[model samples]
Target chain A: HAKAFLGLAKCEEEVDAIEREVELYRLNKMKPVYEKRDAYIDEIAEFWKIVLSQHVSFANYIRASDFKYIDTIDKIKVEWLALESEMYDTRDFSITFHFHGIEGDFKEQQVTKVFQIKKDGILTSEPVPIEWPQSYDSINPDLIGKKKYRQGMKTIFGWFRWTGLKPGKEFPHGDSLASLFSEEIYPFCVKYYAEAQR
Target chain B: GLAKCEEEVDAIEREVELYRLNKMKPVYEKRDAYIDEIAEFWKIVLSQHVSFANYIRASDFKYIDTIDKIKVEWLALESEMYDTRDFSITFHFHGIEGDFKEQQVTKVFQIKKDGILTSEPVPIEWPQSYDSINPDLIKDKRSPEGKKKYRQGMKTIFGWFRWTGLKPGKEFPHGDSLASLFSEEIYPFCVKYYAEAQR
Candidate 1:
């Protein structure tokens, strides 16, 4: 367990590759430096687990009110309101995350932190705040996670593809995976948990 | 392939334009029977995976977090009142009984929200019958053309991977293998609406 948390990573090879490239070409730097990226991912995954365990009873909302993520990412709070009417109307299943983060300081260190999850690349917006929520659709987690699984991480990559969805209310479309994956619930989950934020 | 889809859609449009919804009334009691049957069917298979505590008791009033759905009977009633031939549909299945992926049947259902269902992570294909909800009566599910569009539309919609960096190919926005499976669920709901109207 500790190995997963702190040891030299297995999936984070990309981080090393990116960092090496940056170091080798800082003067003529033409590539992305992501050495710390893996570590950040590890840290984020660790947080993701902790968050999942929480009971965010609301249908399409979740949040963390702490600053362990980044200085700009601690103790802030957030929520995602489901675009329910539009969802049913268009069956499009889209959502906007209201991330609640602020530029604040802790113990004399000026830091910026956020509570919402945002996509990997996007500009900030207001009136409806910028944030991310892991509150996925009320459906099968394994299938959704498998689709999201990355090659390597503290978690075994192969396991991500091991979802065995049985038929039940969990699969409202009756016996087939098509409706399970295509309906309005899945996209909202993706948008909520997207990895990047402004 | 798409040519077939267009031809089918055209046939559905022609029939829907002429058909008036009707109902003799009988599916109401039967719908409850269907729900029970569905629930029972799923119970036998699902029990193997989960030590499930009854998810919904027969007497349960509402599905958690949802307010308007007043038990299964109400859903059947709503089917009679609304037209959803065009609702987006799609689904992601984990294979039926872990078999051919799409052949094993377990659960089938659909969802519509007042706002965008942003949390939907899988594919969602819209159907051609959404426009029919406005008719004062119920419609039929027997149109081969409509069924073709419904099935083909969904097959077209749910037969791919989308929005996943790991998918290793281009991802359609609302069209994907699993994404569109969500779209196909509209047919059953459609059938229920008109069927319930007959009840």
Candidate 2:
């Protein structure tokens, strides 16, 4: 009845208020946010949803016609150690993001954004160095010592974690939270564009 | 000595061919069965979710988009011939029950090769579905309601939460979970692969 009343009036402020109310309704359907007390937060669902969404957004951007020839991220491998049960508060996981098509004047390269779930619930990975293509036998230690990679890791994981915690934060990187967060990530098109030009 | 060396090389070459025919053929079929089963099972469960309308509307298929190009290679042969495994399975599961249509499930591996798979199997786990589970370890029910709740609990434990920012215990968008549960059922299969292969 109240929703029907809004259609009767073309008042601009009233329309705006109704829109806000609708958005709120969409955001919360079952009950008020504070009402649920015993609910176990599904962090894993939110985690993958945010990461995968961001990953696709990044891929689509790099694969766009303008950036086709440049280095682009294509695939993501979420290596979950099935043996590594959620015994504690942490899950053992690593993400290998595949990137290739890097051809610079000085060097040609490919990259992998390796975000690992380490000791803490968070600190799992660091930036590993790149070769044109990674190998099955490729090995690198904790990226903690590699300062550049570590910074990249922090930024990468920070965005994923933040997306999980706050799914609706205004995406700064792009339209979706994942794409918006991609703007702040390493090996984003900017890095490839600079490298590809040479 | 030269004759002996030539014969030795022939023997090895013959063995490799035999391996391809005898060893590789059966394994490929087995792998193919698992692959097909995974797809079929997922289709069923996804259709189950969407059998009700609006299942797709509530989902954020952003991740599904990422998976469309992901190569879930199980076996990595050193150098293969007539490799039927020379493809990537790309799935674009869009839409819901009334609106749901099948997305393409097969694409070439995109290796820039003529018709071949890579030497190293891509290091990824394939989705396994509909496997043995201890009745005690999980909750099972005939009704979609109980099963959906079970899926929700499993999603909390293992699956991606489709409804982001919705508080705990609150229903997700359109009163649906919008995520699939085969990952939970098929996870043990992944565990076995990680154990036997990667380790």
Candidate 3:
């Protein structure tokens, strides 16, 4: 059994090399379509707002105050960073929130969060500060100084301020949030938007 | 404005669908061809995958070693449904050393309107020797803890093969997850899992 397992592992390594080539081919083919889709979404009014509000996972984080920020979202673009090495995976991407005319708490017109996958496969990102007006508090009042807040509470704005992936002490759904934007929310925005209306 | 937005979104979606169907067809075909050339590809891939690997017992490894090929085919619906989540998994095996007569086993699954996933029951023709390998049939009468530990070892991938129905809120046999791992992960990125196992 030990011998067979080792033999299978060698076979898997060979298959892995071929699979990487296939992924590169798929990415090249889909790139233009993705760009075109983003352009169309840019023209649609309240497209990002509707899509975010409708997404079950994303919508859960949106509180009453979060909507003021979410409503101003002109476009939420997820960009896959150019493959620098063969080891490059999907985690090496950036999500930028482009806003309309400044009608929200955030002072900046746009905020971009970049994620990098570590050698150990841990998704890490430096905290991208959201310049919220002093008057508006992003953290929930009830969670202020609470254990849950320290552990990492779920807030729409707090997501932008995420540091990195922590094992036990991590934000609720922090690990999957990036992939959700890059894979599902960005690509299938129209599908979710249509389902929301239904 | 809402009507126009809906119309535009619908058009864009149709365009994207056709693009994937037409543009990506050749890439998929090429990938499939590449996979066909690999020997014991599916077996190695499945063994490496954590979800599938957990269910594979030591006794079941001999049977799994015979798996020549595995194919996942997505079913096209007649009703112009752009996203057809329905699919079938077919496992083709080479000559079996045991009493298993079938060279191929297939399971068809459908994603219903209410988002329920249901599959057709695939009965395996177990050999007479399979009684010793059955995880549920513990031959020894031992201590409760010992019995529990013994039963845990008995859990096999064959048990999952016969699974048919998925109920709301009911935990699945294999770690509370539906057996969609074959279609969702293993089928798409088997190579990634294989590479991980090598490490």
Candidate 4:
């Protein structure tokens, strides 16, 4: 149960590389000399290939059985998005996840969450204050009883067999980022987990 | 798709142009001379290192389909000049699987043959709505006769997979990790470019 999250964790590595390049590009422009322009262009092209390859692998994993339940749910749509570096200025180089059920989640007219990468290289999401429902605490009694587990930076998706589901938090890479997954992500996963089990 | 390829090409061209301004011939023009030789070598490289070698190793090369026809989108430049070993060209290969499902995969193969074979990963993007190929669909359920026809089609579809060195009664051996195929078949074509030439 905690194991499934490992698959979700893989994409972070690819995203981590993109942000580093973005920051490098941002910092390069600030220097007094402008000589690195050509090198930067070449690097973007190289980075672009990696982004696509990463997407191919990430998308493939999402389609596999571990994610089977979440994908099929009409209410939960994870749109696969690719943003070209040309579209954003060097200062704003970051990979973001924008969630929209336009039909809304948890029954509002609309719910939008943006998980953006910050300058320090951490992923941050706007906070959504939620009062955990009475049932939320009881979802996976057996697995939840154990203290949250970690095996070196990985959230231990298997331990996750149950996110009851952080940042300075490192982006899966060693660098500390401004923010990480929102507090809401785990509850949302638990909600979906309940649905998947049913 | 081609934009990235084009950008890299332009970047190389600009760097080469700088050398020309300095009263030296751009190093890439001489490098460009190998385009034809390089392209010609890949046909054999792809056949032997990828498809042919894969088949002989008893891997399921037959599982993937054949290139029904080679349709060149933009003809390789006519004396197109360059400064480095890296080259990229666009072409559409019409792929028809043994199941008779047809789709055109437009691919850009960038070959870098300076000394060691190195090339970008061939990114095959299918239609947005395209689903993964269902191997079960490979078998024809229409009739006993149809089943026989399906196997025959499979043999030819993956042109080189037929020579898989298994005994006469054997079927595809699936134990080989898909990663192995990349290293053995596809990676060699891209990375082992010259080591293979020496062999």
Candidate 5:
């Protein structure tokens, strides 16, 4: 079995090379298309907000307090970065939340998370602190005592506080939330936003 | 602006559909060429696949050995508005020593817009002596512990062929998951899995 698989492994490498070429081809071809789509998305009022609110899993993450911030979201842009890099896969991306006229303790107009792929192929991002007002609560105080909420981070804005992928203290929903945005929500935002109307 | 946005979204969606359709054609062709040259390619691939491999058993290896080729064909939907998840999986057999008359078996799955998968059960002509090939068909008359082991062993790929639809409370609980895995991962990256098997 080892001998047979070894021979097949050579073939697999050849296939991988072709697959990489295809990835480059896709990146080149879709560059202009994505740019155009992003421009069009900017014109649509509350596009990202509707898309986020419509998503079933993501919707649960948003709390009543989250809407005060989410409502001010002018645009949420997800950019695929360093995909052409030899070390990086297509998963390496940056999500920037562009906020409009919003009053808060947070002075920044935008919050961005740059998710990078390590040499070991693990997806991780450094924590970006959100300056919430004194009265604002990221996680519901009542639910903090519950075992489910106690285990890991909960709440939509709470994602901004994610340290990274740790061994034992990793946020349970962190990886999946990142995947949902990059894989499903960002790519098919229009389709998901349409589902919201229904 | 909303109408303009809708037009662009539609155009973007079509581009994505066309992109996938064109890109996969050459990939399928190249994979077919390599697969034809390799001996027992399908067997090795199936064994390597994480989801499909679990369904394979020691007893099923005899039947699996006879498999000459396994083909997965994606069928486009009538609307053609988006890429269809509907596909057919075919297993072609070569030389058989037993009384199994059929040379090939095919099962077509329809993935509806609502995400429900429906498929017609494909019948298999099992040889008289080889009736014990599928553990699911066997009548369990053993102890509870023995029956549990029997249940675990019963989830062979042959039984997967006979799978009709997703039953929430019944047998084949992982039917939907297995179906999606076959099309999305197993079929697309068989060669990758084959290489990983060695490591």
Candidate 6:
């Protein structure tokens, strides 16, 4: 996973380098590039070509899956959020899951950006959308064991496998942030231009 | 009709339910698949050392880790749009009596932020033909072929790896450690670099 992260970052970087070189190469053609600068610029141009050769052809090759169930039956004084959200509002979208704590586990996390490409290649909501109790100890068989299986959300599609459903946490974030699904993020991603036909 | 807007709401609910289940079905399976798929990718990573020889110069190449440091310094210079930084570059020779002294080459703007390659890792523009050695001999001679030979030497050294069953580390090919044959000149650099890398 760490290595994948590095490769993704590196791939982005290779494209960026090529762009930089094309600009530099243009400048060198117009102006007299000194020996050192000329050599340096040429090396970049070649390096970009060599490393980015295989990568530029591919798009959105990374992905992961996550499943979560939420139960929202109570009517608490709720304030839904992000009135000034940072979104661009586009059609392109993908979904992602957040796993923390263990090496692929979604537990103790300070911060993480692991993301994935949806089948249709849209933008994800940055997190998943559902909620859970602070810890697993709060399972009440009498209330939510097999009886309280109500409707929550699992994704934009809203399908979920409700094994043991009860009251689930909504992200006021006073609660846990694992299995933290998100609102639609694709619309905004397309709005910004991260995804073209996203 | 029994409902109008209510019908749309119910329809949307069904769709959302479908989406959630679709997303749920492959979560664990996909994660495991991705792990294995990506592990396959890293197998190609260390092998890049072969390509590194094509770019790095004998004088310029010291330790891979040092090359990484040089790349960082170059990036510092580049981030300022070709501005200068305060640092010295040196290549410590590993041979006896300065017979094969290491040369620390300098480059003002050496890094290509695209990849974290050091000054030496980035290939020099001047063609190797100008600094020609007999291509046919292919000894570790100080020519392009020599660099190629050196890279091959490193591969032979690394070929001793046994975890994946390429070369057997269990049985000795000979009395000496492969490290000594490949050249122990890189040992101190790797050692010191790892030590100070903690800071």
TM-score of chain B of 3: 0.67
- In candidate 4 the C-alpha lDDT for residue B53 amounts to 49
Q: With candidate 2 superimposed using the best TM-score fit, by how many Å does residue B194's alpha carbon deviate from the native?
A: 42
* Candidate 1 lDDT for residue B199: 51
TM-score of every model versus the real structure? 0.16, 0.19, 0.54, 0.23, 0.64, 0.24
| Per-residue C-alpha lDDT of model 1 across residues B49-140, encoded as one tens digit per residue | 22112322222111111111112211222453333222232222222232122221112233334322122234332222323321112254
After superposition, candidate 1 runs with Cα above 4 Å error: A1-198, B1-33, B37-40, B43-85, B88-175, B179-199
Q: Would you list the rank order by lDDT, best first? A: 5, 3, 2, 4, 6, 1
lDDT of 6 at A28: 30
- Pick by TM-score: which candidate is best? 5
Report the TM-score of the second chain of model 5 against its true counterpart. 0.72
**Top lDDT: which candidate number?**
5
For residues A1-198, could you state the per-residue lDDT of candidate 6 as single tens digits?
466444444444544444443433333332222222223323332222222122321112111122121111111011122111213222221223222233232343222222222333432334323333333223322234332322223221122222122325221221112122222221111122222323
CAPRI-style quality class for the chain A–B interface of candidate 3? incorrect
Instruction: State residue B169's C-alpha deviation in candidate 6, in Å.
Output: 27
The whole-model lDDT of each prediction reads 0.26, 0.32, 0.63, 0.31, 0.65, 0.28
| Per-residue C-alpha lDDT of model 3 across residues B56-172, encoded as one tens digit per residue | 667667677777777776664333552456667788767466555457888777766547567655766554456554444556638675555445443555655655556432222
Where is model 4 more than 4 Å wrong at Cα? A1-132, A139-144, A147-198, B1-33, B38-40, B43-50, B54-199
Docking class of 5: incorrect
The digit string of per-residue lDDT tens for model 4 on B1-199 reads 3234334445554444342222212222222233333334334344555344433333323323233322222112322443333223333333344433344443322233333322233334332122222123444545676656444433332322222323333333331222234433343233244336646
Winner by DockQ between candidate 5 and candidate 2: 5
Native contacts retained, all candidates in order: 0.00, 0.00, 0.00, 0.00, 0.02, 0.05
Candidate 2 residue-wise lDDT, A48-151, digit = tens:
22333344345453213223322244433333332233332213334445444444521233333333333324423333454322211121123224443433
Say which docking band candidate 1 falls in.
incorrect
Q: What is the DockQ of each candidate?
A: 0.01, 0.01, 0.08, 0.01, 0.12, 0.04
Ranking of all predicted structures according to TM-score, beginning with the best and ending with the worst: 5, 3, 6, 4, 2, 1
The model with the greater lDDT, 1 or 3, is 3
Q: What lDDT score is found at residue A55 in candidate 6?
A: 31
Candidate 4: TM-score, chain B only? 0.29
